Amino acid sequence: LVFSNCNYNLTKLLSLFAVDEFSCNGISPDAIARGCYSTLTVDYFAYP
Amino acid sequence: YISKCSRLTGDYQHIETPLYINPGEYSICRDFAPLGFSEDGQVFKRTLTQFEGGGLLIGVGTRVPMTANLEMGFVISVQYGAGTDSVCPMLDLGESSTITNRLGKCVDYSLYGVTGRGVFQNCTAVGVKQQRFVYDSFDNLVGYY
Amino acid sequence: YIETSIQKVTVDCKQYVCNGFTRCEKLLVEYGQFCSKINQALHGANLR
Amino acid sequence: LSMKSYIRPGSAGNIPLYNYKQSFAHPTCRVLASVPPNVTITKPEAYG
Amino acid sequence: QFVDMSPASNNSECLDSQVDAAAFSKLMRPYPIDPAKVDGIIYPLGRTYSNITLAYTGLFPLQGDLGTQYLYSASHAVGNDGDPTKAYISNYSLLVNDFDNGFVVRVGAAANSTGTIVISPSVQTKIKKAYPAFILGSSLTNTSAGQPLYANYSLTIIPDGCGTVLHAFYCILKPRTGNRCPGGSGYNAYFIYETIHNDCNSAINKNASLNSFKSFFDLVNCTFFNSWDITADEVKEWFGITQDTQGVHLYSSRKGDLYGGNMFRFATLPVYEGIKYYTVIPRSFRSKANRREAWAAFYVYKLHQLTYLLDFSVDGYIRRTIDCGHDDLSQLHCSYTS
Ligand SMILES: *[C@@H]1O[C@H](CO)[C@@H](O[C@@H]2O[C@H](CO)[C@@H](O[C@@H]3O[C@H](CO)[C@@H](O)[C@H](O)[C@H]3NC(C)=O)[C@H](O)[C@H]2NC(C)=O)[C@H](O)[C@H]1NC(C)=O
Ligand SMILES: *[C@@H]1O[C@H](CO)[C@@H](O[C@@H]2O[C@H](CO)[C@@H](O)[C@H](O)[C@H]2NC(C)=O)[C@H](O)[C@H]1NC(C)=O
Ligand SMILES: *[C@@H]1O[C@H](CO)[C@@H](O[C@@H]2O[C@H](CO)[C@@H](O)[C@H](O)[C@H]2NC(C)=O)[C@H](O)[C@H]1NC(C)=O
Ligand SMILES: *[C@@H]1O[C@H](CO)[C@@H](O)[C@H](O)[C@H]1NC(C)=O
Ligand SMILES: *[C@@H]1O[C@H](CO)[C@@H](O)[C@H](O)[C@H]1NC(C)=O
Numbered sequence: 001l002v003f004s005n006c007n008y009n010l011t012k013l014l015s016l017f018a019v020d021e022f023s024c025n026g027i028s029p030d031a032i033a034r035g036c037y038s039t040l041t042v043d044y045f046a047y048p
Numbered sequence: 049y050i051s052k053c054s055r056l057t058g059d060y061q062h063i064e065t066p067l068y069i070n071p072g073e074y075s076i077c078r079d080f081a082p083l084g085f086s087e088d089g090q091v092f093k094r095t096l097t098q099f100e101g102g103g104l105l106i107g108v109g110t111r112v113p114m115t116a117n118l119e120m121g122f123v124i125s126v127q128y129g130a131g132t133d134s135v136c137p138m139l140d141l142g143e144s145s146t147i148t149n150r151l152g153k154c155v156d157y158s159l160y161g162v163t164g165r166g167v168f169q170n171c172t173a174v175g176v177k178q179q180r181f182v183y184d185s186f187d188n189l190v191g192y193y
Numbered sequence: 194y195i196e197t198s199i200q201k202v203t204v205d206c207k208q209y210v211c212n213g214f215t216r217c218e219k220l221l222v223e224y225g226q227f228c229s230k231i232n233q234a235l236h237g238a239n240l241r
Numbered sequence: 242l243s244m245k246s247y248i249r250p251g252s253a254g255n256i257p258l259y260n261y262k263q264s265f266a267h268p269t270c271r272v273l274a275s276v277p278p279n280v281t282i283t284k285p286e287a288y289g
Numbered sequence: 290q291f292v293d294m295s296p297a298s299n300n301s302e303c304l305d306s307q308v309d310a311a312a313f314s315k316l317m318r319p320y321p322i323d324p325a326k327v328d329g330i331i332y333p334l335g336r337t338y339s340n341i342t343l344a345y346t347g348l349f350p351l352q353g354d355l356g357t358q359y360l361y362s363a364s365h366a367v368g369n370d371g372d373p374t375k376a377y378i379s380n381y382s383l384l385v386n387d388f389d390n391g392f393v394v395r396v397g398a399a400a401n402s403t404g405t406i407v408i409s410p411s412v413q414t415k416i417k418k419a420y421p422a423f424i425l426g427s428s429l430t431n432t433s434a435g436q437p438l439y440a441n442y443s444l445t446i447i448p449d450g451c452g453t454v455l456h457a458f459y460c461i462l463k464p465r466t467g468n469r470c471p472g473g474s475g476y477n478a479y480f481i482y483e484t485i486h487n488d489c490n491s492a493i494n495k496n497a498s499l500n501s502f503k504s505f506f507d508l509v510n511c512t513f514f515n516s517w518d519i520t521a522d523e524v525k526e527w528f529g530i531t532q533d534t535q536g537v538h539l540y541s542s543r544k545g546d547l548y549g550g551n552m553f554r555f556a557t558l559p560v561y562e563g564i565k566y567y568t569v570i571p572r573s574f575r576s577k578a579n580r581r582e583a584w585a586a587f588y589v590y591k592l593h594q595l596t597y598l599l600d601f602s603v604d605g606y607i608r609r610t611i612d613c614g615h616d617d618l619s620q621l622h623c624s625y626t627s
């Protein structure tokens with residue numbers, strides 16, 4: 001999913017998932033969660 | 049998950065070349081079983097045409113039991129300077145959203161996904177208006193539309 | 194004995210730094226405003 | 242222990258905002274442990 | 290989650306045509322890539338400069354590259370005022386190319402000038418701009434004898450509306466089983482064909498070429514369908530197609546620099562599979578023999594990962610470029626970035 005020119009509700013994303021592991025390179029979660037970006041790209045899959 | 053994806057070649061079909069994917073790319077063995085593998089270690093064979101290279105493409109798939117709760121993986125990537133529109137968290141329009149009266153004072157600007165510190169003045173239009181940011185040789189912002 | 198000159202040496206910034214490895218050169222493209230300054234400085238010193 | 246990722250430095254949850262933020266002015270260690278059955282520390286009714 | 294292509298073609302069989310590759314292969318009016326006259330240059334994304342020269346590393350064509358030349362002919366018509374009978378096309382549809390990095394297209398090169406008519410060598414008339422049609426995909430197959438047909442999902446880019454609308458749809462092509470169609474008995478070639486009388490000299494039908502396409506393939510589940518509007522003129526222009534992790538980006542000069550010729554992005558389609566092959570669809574023009582007019586060729590240059598030296602005017606447009614690897618003097622000029 002490619003996101004450009006939109007706004008996302010963080011309240012929902014906090015509740016719809018229970019995070020078990022963060023691992024970030026170059027960025028931190030509370031910079032995607034507090035800053036505005038030219039584009040987001042999310043690759044999602046089902047993984048044990 | 050796919051555990052073996054290799055190309056068979058040879059008159060005796062005795063040459064195996066493992067096929068590896070590049071970052072952020074799909075696999076040629078994706079279309080063997082797009083949904084899932086019905087049995088552990090399931091093996092599929094398919095023939096390739098001359099345009100792709102030819103031979104017997106081979107795939108093997110492994111099956112892992114489903115857990116009580118669906119567990120998911122996400123890869124998030126942020127791209128800078130890929131346009132003139134931005135992705136943002138839902139937030140109220142800040143009262144600091146105007147600059148018409150604070151010309152000449154150092155401010156921390158966050159404009160459409162480009163961030164920095166600067167002083168704004170009124171100037172004549174240069175560059176292409178369509179792209180909203182004018183840069184110098186050293187990748188510093190010098191004009192804003 | 195009176196010395197009147199030194200040996201004129203010039204350097205290739207993209208060969209000294211990255212010994213022909215294309216993996217290294219691609220990271221040096223972000224640089225290369227620091228290579229020209231080395232190349233231009235040595236050209237002037239040899240010109241003088 | 243199921244919310245360990247939310248106590249890490251750089252999480253995007255509500256723990257660093259309204260619950261607990263760690264200070265890195267000094268050498269620090271964040272330890273998550275489990276109290277054995279026979280150790281006398283009364284459990285709360287739930288986590289909050 | 291699928292757009293519906295409800296007006297499916299009910300045609301009994303695909304239209305007959307005669308393919309003659311030798312006739313088109315003879316014509317040649319080369320256009321080597323010349324950095325001095327800015328050619329096929331993608332303007333930097335999301336940023337502009339004014340009155341400055343710098344070095345940009347991106348997707349650029351090679352200097353002095355001949356490219357590939359494609360021609361669109363007229364249609365066979367019996368009688369001076371008779372309606373067109375059958376299509377005259379080249380074998381473009383049977384050839385599979387590589388999309389490795391992307392490609393740029395010179396369009397409307399021979400506009401405003403006289404030239405021969407392909408179908409009738411004797412007739413010489415003024416040439417008109419003809420936009421290309423593309424199919425891009427990631428996997429292939431054959432009918433039975435080796436004619437190439439695209440697999441599950443294909444991006445199809447077709448101009449319509451007598452050169453006034455551009456249609457791009459990412460969807461599934463199912464070979465139709467009609468007579469002499471790709472799933473039929475005698476499959477010579479697939480092409481798009483439009484009658485000038487139906488649309489151009491009337492309320493312009495923005496679906497003619499798409500309707501012709503539906504005769505050859507059925508549009509199975511067929512995710513998305515996008516359409517942009519094209520102003521009608523006879524100016525030369527540039528077009529470009531690129532792909533990366535955000536999808537398939539489309540560039541054109543008409544979006545921002547109609548006269549200078551710099552290419553600006555206007556669309557980012559969500560095609561993330563990874564395009565490996567592309568093919569030009571023959572586009573025959575159908576009308577009477579007297580109305581027959583020659584249509585300008587287009588040139589498909591191939592993009593490579595290169596560095597150029599770009600000169601930006603005060604208005605922000607590019608007027609001079611140097612390919613930094615063509616020869617020693619070019620590398621010297623880029624080394625001093627001036
Ligand atoms: C083929 O013929 C076309 C017309 O038959 C030519 O189209 C003309 O191109 C001119 C530029 O070469 C245009 O001039 C522009 O006019 C606008 C309107 O006022 C100005 O803003 C622009 O500044 C001006 N361009 C420049 C560079 O100053 C004409 O308007 C335009 N006319 C029509 C009817 O389209 C083609 O140029 C000509 N050559 C080619 C290669 O197609
Ligand atoms: C041209 O063809 C397109 C097919 O892509 C038509 O768009 C669809 O038309 C059908 C039939 O009316 C509708 O049910 C669909 O909802 C349309 N698609 C969308 C996305 O709205 C289009 O109407 C045709 N135009 C003309 C003039 O025939
Ligand atoms: C075209 O596709 C066919 C099947 O889809 C491929 O199979 C061969 O087809 C040729 C004739 O086209 C037959 O003589 C062979 O016996 C077929 N092989 C098998 C194993 O059945 C064919 O390889 C593809 N390519 C060409 C050039 O025909
Ligand atoms: C958080 O999400 C809720 C949805 O229930 C929404 O009403 C609220 O506005 C969001 N927070 C902010 C700051 O927008
Ligand atoms: C297509 O036509 C060209 C021009 O003659 C020819 O060289 C080529 O072999 C043809 N290809 C096919 C597949 O017919």
Ligand SMILES: *[C@@H]1O[C@H](CO)[C@@H](O)[C@H](O)[C@H]1NC(C)=O
Pocket residue numbers: 340603
């Ligand atoms: C553009 O840059 C040149 C290079 O120094 C300079 O001489 C000139 O004044 C600048 N402005 C214009 C309008 O050319």
Ligand SMILES: *[C@@H]1O[C@H](CO)[C@@H](O)[C@H](O)[C@H]1NC(C)=O
Pocket residue numbers: 079082430440441
């Ligand atoms: C793609 O098309 C081929 C053609 O036969 C088919 O075998 C294959 O299953 C298709 N792929 C998917 C994912 O359905």
Ligand SMILES: *[C@@H]1O[C@H](CO)[C@@H](O)[C@H](O)[C@H]1NC(C)=O
Pocket residue numbers: 461509510
């Ligand atoms: C189109 O979608 C339907 C339902 O989603 C599916 O059954 C069908 O196989 C799809 N078409 C192809 C060619 O796979």
